[PDB]
């Protein structure tokens, strides 16, 4: 077993993705105009989480469509995306062809939703979000011991687990958080369909045994995760409870997020595998 | 193992969710009156998946908004009753309270859909799902053995495996199988995330995974070579049906068919048999 605390570990982070999750926060385009209203936004890839949890209709035949056609886009069609009426249309994204540039990375949502929040004049829950993230990082740097460290204290729940992730306050986070786990930590992690709380009651009878290798990790408040958990306890492995810091909800969203990006990191470093993306082209 | 081609195999299902399978088209509450459009819908629990399929925008000012209320919504059902303007509200649903009655069923899903398509002059969408659900159900039920039914073949190859449900046709469903998995098979599945081919690419290197292709599309193409390599096992399940709606409705049956027999398979029953109940109550 690896130990997170021991400067060797650390070796396979060779692009140094410790450095950039801990200086995440500001960093992205910022909106250099006002864009006319109403505003829509659909998101492809990186962009998808930020569209949704920006909660802005996913269309429009006039003001301003930010089309996020964002990186690790595979096979998503987001070039498809036709008819827009008199809307003015926005790229941001990763192609040469757009009009707002953010390259690809598996922190990119952060920055997606931060020059959306900007463009629609929601700078003040953007400040919250930012604080919140500030917040928790002081806790989750490598120079922080595991025992003080909850990234690196889930890692080692997750290791050699199944990770299952459940976020009542808005399911989205579910699928961002399995998308952290597989492109950072490249591995395999579940979410529960719509109705959750049933998956859990009844998915795990057929084969008791089916629980023994899973990890139900709890994200946020909620009386869902209470319901979740006194469900789980007695039939899981392993049962983690997410706090989820921040003041409102898109604060404790991405609190939520940036906390699973640290751990997802963190778990990388445990299976001795490179948390960075792979060169698609060489 | 057991066997799906011997009678004593089936007495675990005392409920008889088989005869509910077969005769599933053409049951679940008509409409008697021309509710006035526009239309729109919000669901949940097992009125959720049908409320997307319909395409009806979530919310309306005027003319009918169908509440399909299927459960786990924890009062948010009430709350948006009370939000809804000069719509007008239509509840439907389990709870004694409601205007249209559906009582649960992991099968419900297709009568809370058929009671939408026909609320909202649809009958010909209807029907198309209904002639592809009567074609599939031919070689699903009990009497068709083994070597010719899909959804015993397919629940052999489910048995002992973590089932993994990718359907680019419709993303939805999924999420819907998954729950068909849960509620039936009483066993543990999962779906890809949005990114679902990237997730393919590098997640994926418990039971052994068994990759269950839903529907034809440019993207499964690309997934079956993604996965081939790095599963245990692959299934490409094809998508009876003249139109994308028919489509997912008859993967969706065929699905919930192999659920049933991978539940006997473990000998357990597929049925509810009250294990809902209070999970219900205080949700």
């Known amino acids: 077993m690896r130990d997170l605390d021991r400067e060797e570990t650390y070796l396979v982070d060779r692009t140094g993705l410790a450095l950039e999750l801990r ?36 269309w429009g035949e006039e003001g301003t469509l930010f089309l996020l056609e964002g990186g690790y886009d595979l096979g998503e069609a987001a ?35 931060r020059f959306l929040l900007l463009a629609t004049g929601r700078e003040e829950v953007l400040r919250s979000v930012d604080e919140a993230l500030l917040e928790e990082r002081r806790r989750l740097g490598p120079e922080v011991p595991v025992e003080e460290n909850p990234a690196k204290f889930l890692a080692y729940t997750l290791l050699e687990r199944l990770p299952l992730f459940y976020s009542p306050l808005f399911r989205p986070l579910e699928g961002a958080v399995q998308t952290l786990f597989a492109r950072v930590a490249k591995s395999l992690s579940l979410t529960p369909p719509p ?30 995760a209470a319901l979740a958990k006194e469900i789980l306890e007695s039939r899981v492995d392993a049962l983690a409870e997410v706090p989820a810091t921040g003041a ?35």
């Open 23 to 58: 200086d995440l926060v500001g960093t992205g385009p910022v909106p250099g105009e006002a864009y006319p209203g109403p505003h829509a936004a659909l998101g492809y890839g990186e962009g998808q989480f930020a569209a949704l949890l920006s909660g802005l209709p996913d």
């Open 79 to 113: 070039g498809m995306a036709a008819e827009t009426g008199r809307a003015r249309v926005v790229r941001v994204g990763f192609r040469p062809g757009v009009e707002v540039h953010i390259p690809p990375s598996p922190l990119a949502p952060y920055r997606y939703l």
């Open 195 to 224: 109705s959750a709380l049933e998956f859990f009651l009844v998915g795990l009878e057929a084969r008791h045994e089916q629980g023994d290798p899973l990890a139900a990790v709890l994200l946020g408040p909620g009386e869902e």
């Open 248 to 282: 409102n909800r898109l604060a404790q969203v991405m609190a939520l997020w940036y906390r699973m990006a640290w751990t997802a990191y963190y778990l990388a470093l445990l299976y001795g595998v490179d948390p960075g993306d792979h060169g698609l082209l060489e």
